[PDB]
Short mmCIF file of N, CA and C in Angstrom, two decimals:
data_model
loop_
_atom_site.label_atom_id
_atom_site.label_comp_id
_atom_site.label_asym_id
_atom_site.label_seq_id
_atom_site.Cartn_x
_atom_site.Cartn_y
_atom_site.Cartn_z
N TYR A 1 152.29 -16.80 -104.66
CA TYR A 1 153.59 -16.51 -104.06
C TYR A 1 153.60 -16.87 -102.58
N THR A 2 152.56 -16.46 -101.87
CA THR A 2 152.44 -16.74 -100.44
C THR A 2 152.24 -18.23 -100.19
N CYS A 3 151.30 -18.82 -100.92
CA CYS A 3 151.01 -20.24 -100.78
C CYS A 3 151.65 -21.05 -101.90
N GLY A 4 151.96 -22.31 -101.61
CA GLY A 4 152.57 -23.17 -102.61
C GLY A 4 152.21 -24.63 -102.42
N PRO A 5 152.89 -25.51 -103.17
CA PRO A 5 152.65 -26.96 -103.10
C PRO A 5 153.13 -27.56 -101.79
N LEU A 6 154.26 -27.06 -101.29
CA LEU A 6 154.83 -27.55 -100.04
C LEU A 6 154.07 -26.99 -98.84
N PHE A 7 153.55 -25.78 -98.99
CA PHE A 7 152.81 -25.13 -97.92
C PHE A 7 151.36 -24.87 -98.35
N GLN A 8 150.64 -25.94 -98.66
CA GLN A 8 149.25 -25.83 -99.08
C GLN A 8 148.31 -25.95 -97.89
N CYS A 9 147.10 -25.43 -98.04
CA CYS A 9 146.10 -25.48 -96.98
C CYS A 9 145.57 -26.90 -96.80
N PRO A 10 144.99 -27.17 -95.62
CA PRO A 10 144.43 -28.48 -95.29
C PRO A 10 143.17 -28.79 -96.09
N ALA A 11 142.81 -30.07 -96.15
CA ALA A 11 141.62 -30.49 -96.88
C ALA A 11 140.38 -29.75 -96.39
N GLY A 12 139.78 -28.97 -97.28
CA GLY A 12 138.59 -28.21 -96.92
C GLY A 12 138.83 -26.72 -96.93
N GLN A 13 140.06 -26.31 -96.65
CA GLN A 13 140.42 -24.90 -96.63
C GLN A 13 141.37 -24.56 -97.78
N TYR A 14 141.29 -23.32 -98.25
CA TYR A 14 142.14 -22.86 -99.34
C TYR A 14 143.00 -21.68 -98.91
N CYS A 15 144.12 -21.49 -99.61
CA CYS A 15 145.03 -20.39 -99.30
C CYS A 15 144.49 -19.07 -99.84
N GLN A 16 144.63 -18.01 -99.04
CA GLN A 16 144.16 -16.69 -99.44
C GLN A 16 145.21 -15.63 -99.14
N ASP A 17 145.53 -14.82 -100.14
CA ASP A 17 146.52 -13.76 -99.99
C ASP A 17 145.85 -12.45 -99.59
N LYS A 18 146.01 -12.07 -98.33
CA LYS A 18 145.42 -10.83 -97.82
C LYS A 18 146.41 -10.08 -96.94
N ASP A 19 146.45 -8.76 -97.09
CA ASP A 19 147.35 -7.93 -96.30
C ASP A 19 148.79 -8.40 -96.44
N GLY A 20 149.14 -8.87 -97.63
CA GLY A 20 150.49 -9.36 -97.87
C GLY A 20 150.81 -10.60 -97.07
N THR A 21 149.78 -11.36 -96.72
CA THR A 21 149.96 -12.58 -95.94
C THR A 21 149.05 -13.69 -96.44
N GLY A 22 149.37 -14.93 -96.06
CA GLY A 22 148.57 -16.06 -96.49
C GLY A 22 147.79 -16.68 -95.34
N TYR A 23 146.50 -16.93 -95.57
CA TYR A 23 145.65 -17.52 -94.55
C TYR A 23 144.75 -18.60 -95.15
N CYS A 24 144.36 -19.56 -94.31
CA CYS A 24 143.51 -20.66 -94.76
C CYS A 24 142.05 -20.37 -94.43
N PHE A 25 141.21 -20.34 -95.47
CA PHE A 25 139.79 -20.07 -95.29
C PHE A 25 138.96 -21.30 -95.66
N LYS A 26 137.85 -21.49 -94.94
CA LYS A 26 136.97 -22.63 -95.19
C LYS A 26 136.06 -22.35 -96.38
N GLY A 27 136.66 -22.11 -97.54
CA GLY A 27 135.88 -21.84 -98.74
C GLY A 27 135.67 -20.35 -98.97
N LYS A 28 135.67 -19.58 -97.88
CA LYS A 28 135.47 -18.14 -97.97
C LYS A 28 136.79 -17.40 -97.80
#
Protein backbone atom coordinates (compact mmCIF):
# COMPACT_ATOMS: atom_id res chain seq x y z
CA TYR A 1 0.00 0.00 0.00
CA THR A 2 2.77 2.42 0.98
CA CYS A 3 5.08 1.43 -1.88
CA GLY A 4 4.09 0.80 -5.49
CA PRO A 5 5.25 0.51 -9.11
CA LEU A 6 5.30 4.28 -9.66
CA PHE A 7 6.98 4.90 -6.30
CA GLN A 8 9.45 2.02 -6.09
CA CYS A 9 12.80 2.07 -4.30
CA PRO A 10 16.10 2.64 -6.16
CA ALA A 11 18.29 -0.18 -7.49
CA GLY A 12 19.74 -1.91 -4.44
CA GLN A 13 17.17 -0.74 -1.90
CA TYR A 14 13.70 -2.13 -1.18
CA CYS A 15 10.52 -0.57 0.20
CA GLN A 16 9.69 -1.24 3.85
CA ASP A 17 6.45 -0.48 5.69
CA LYS A 18 7.24 0.67 9.22
CA ASP A 19 5.36 2.93 11.64
CA GLY A 20 2.70 3.35 8.97
CA THR A 21 5.31 4.76 6.61
CA GLY A 22 7.48 3.61 3.71
CA TYR A 23 11.27 3.68 3.73
CA CYS A 24 14.05 2.42 1.47
CA PHE A 25 16.46 -0.06 3.06
CA LYS A 26 19.68 -1.46 1.61
CA GLY A 27 18.47 -5.04 1.87
CA LYS A 28 17.74 -4.70 5.58
